Amino acid sequence: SAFWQWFSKFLGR
């Protein structure tokens, strides 16, 4: 993924 969201693009708080 691109933006962060529930650990989408990689890892999003």
- The residues, ordered by sequence, that sit 6+ positions from 12 with a Cβ below 8 Å of its Cβ are 3, 4, 5, 6
The technique is NMR
Q: CB neighbours of 3 closer than 8 A, spacing ≥ 6? A: 9, 12
First to last CA, the chain: 15
Q: How far from chain centre, in Å, is Cα 6?
A: 6
DSSP 1-13: --S-SSSSSS---
Which residue do the tokens 């999003």 mark? 12
Check: CB of residue 12 under 8 Å from CB of residue 6.
yes
Is 3 in contact with 11 (CB distance < 8 Å)? no
What is the torsion angle, in degrees rounded to the nearest 10, for the CA atoms of residue 5, residue 7, residue 4 and residue 13?
80
* Token code pair at residue 5: 């969201």
